[PDB]
Write a protein that binds this ligand. Sequence first.
Ligand SMILES: [Ca+2]
Ligand SMILES: [Ca+2]
Length: 76
Amino acid sequence: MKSPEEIKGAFEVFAAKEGDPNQISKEELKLVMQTLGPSLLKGMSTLDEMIEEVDKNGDGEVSFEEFLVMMKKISQ
Ligand SMILES: [Ca+2]
Ligand SMILES: [Ca+2]
């Protein structure tokens, strides 16, 4: 899996499109989904499945810590 620094770079770009600069909203996660596409796993590859898997605290947005866990899961 990518290093925490590489993942942080990608996270920051996606998270600073709209709203909270430090969280990825569902609408921002749509762009993450479009970029990761066929690398997303079965059961976490629709936008709904993805955020449900990734958003551990249920605030409806994806934090850096949550995003790191997502990237780990995708790459085994
Ligand atoms: Ca954001
Ligand atoms: Ca969250």
